[PDB]
Design a protein around this ligand. Structure first.
Ligand code: NA
Length: 378
């Protein structure tokens, strides 16, 4: 069991797909800071890519082309083979880290999916379809499934009333990832929680608990992006990046806009230089998120026709009609290993840097693409 599965025939395309993932994470945080500066939040883009990939196997020509442009993939062979590899990775558990990413497609009991869709969803993703009554307790059916299957009880993005007989295709994903810390003598780890003073984006002053953490890492002040960045490994292959503004004014928008370009993260990862890190970070080691991607995809100006009731661009999702996409749910639990009382006693909590204002994080795998991106503003 490992997380380096790659298609050997479409290798370049898999690397390009990771660049699409990296860039979507950038669009995501750029939009969060613009539209939702009051929110602390995090997310993963892999389930969105998987959903769009699935749709790209079942679309008419123009829609297929638009889907391909967003995926950085350009053929059925690429979509199938890249996604089979990445799906395997994101469903592997081993001693290095554990990942689960499971997909469902919902439709009303009287509108069954095409056998073509059911087959390709199973083939590429081990996706499963569910036929439910859109007139009776459909929100609860979905909520209960996501929460039960994932073990994650956070509330879902739907509210009762959101689903009726005119509702179209509903796609869902749940992602559960667990990361242990490195096991080297100087692996960066959290040790103990300490009080810090925090100043929120809107100026609110408060006290927070923060994990005093230390170990080998990397650091840079990156003037052109207006940020300082701290970087450390988990188990080998995995990297966390923490960033925060150079200025007290939290001028983060230029950094987030640049993160829309996948080159920016590759640049960041080389600008940093080795530094022993002693930090205090106000973050929870278990984080949960549940969202509907569609509002964010619409904010980005992408694929807007797919979400209209009159859409006619799908070919083989249904035998009798196009169908349209109503909700794209992503239900996420991110967990980091908890430190022990014995570990706490081994260090003196004297941080060189405290994250005492808005900051962001990315967690990367061995392909240097983010499994998750998060933003803390308050
Ligand atoms: Na470097």
């Amino acid at each position: 069991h490992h997380h380096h599965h790659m298609t050997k025939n479409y290798t370049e395309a898999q690397l390009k797909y990771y660049d699409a993932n990296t860039g979507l994470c950038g669009i995501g945080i750029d939009q969060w800071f613009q539209y939702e500066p009051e929110r602390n939040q995090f997310s993963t883009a892999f389930p969105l890519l998987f959903m769009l990939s699935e749709l790209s196997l079942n679309s008419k020509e123009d829609t297929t082309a638009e889907l391909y442009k967003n995926l950085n993939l350009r053929s059925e062979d690429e979509v199938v083979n890249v996604n089979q590899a990445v799906n395997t990775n994101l469903n592997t558990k081993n001693e290095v880290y554990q990942s689960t990413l499971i997909l469902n497609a919902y439709t009303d009991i009287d509108s069954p999916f095409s056998e073509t869709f059911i087959q390709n969803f199973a083939k590429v993703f081990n996706g499963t379809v569910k036929n439910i009554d859109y007139s009776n307790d459909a929100v609860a059916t979905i909520r209960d499934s996501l929460q039960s299957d994932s073990g994650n009880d956070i509330e879902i993005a739907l509210k009762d009333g959101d689903i009726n007989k005119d509702t179209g295709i509903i796609l869902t994903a749940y992602t559960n990832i667990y990361f242990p810390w490195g096991e080297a003598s100087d692996s960066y780890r959290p040790y103990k929680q300490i009080d810090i003073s925090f100043t929120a984006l809107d100026g609110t002053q408060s006290n927070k608990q923060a994990w005093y953490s230390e170990g080998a890492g990397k650091y840079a002040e990156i003037e052109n992006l207006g940020i300082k960045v701290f970087q450390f490994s988990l188990k080998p292959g995995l990297t966390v990046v923490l960033g925060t503004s150079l200025n007290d004014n939290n001028d983060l928008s230029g950094a987030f806009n640049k993160l829309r370009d996948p080159a920016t993260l590759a640049y960041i990862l080389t600008q940093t230089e080795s530094k022993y890190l002693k930090l205090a970070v106000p973050i929870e080691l278990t984080m949960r998120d549940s969202r509907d991607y569609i509002p964010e995809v619409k904010r980005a100006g992408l694929l807007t026709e797919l979400f209209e009731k009159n859409f006619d661009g799908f070919d083989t999702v249904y035998d009798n009609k196009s169908g349209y996409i109503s909700y794209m749910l992503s239900h996420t639990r991110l967990e980091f290993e908890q430190p022990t009382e014995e570990q706490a006693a081994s260090v003196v909590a004297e941080p060189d840097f405290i994250f005492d204002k808005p900051y962001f994080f990315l967690v990367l795998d061995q392909f240097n693409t983010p499994a998750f991106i998060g933003l803390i503003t308050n």
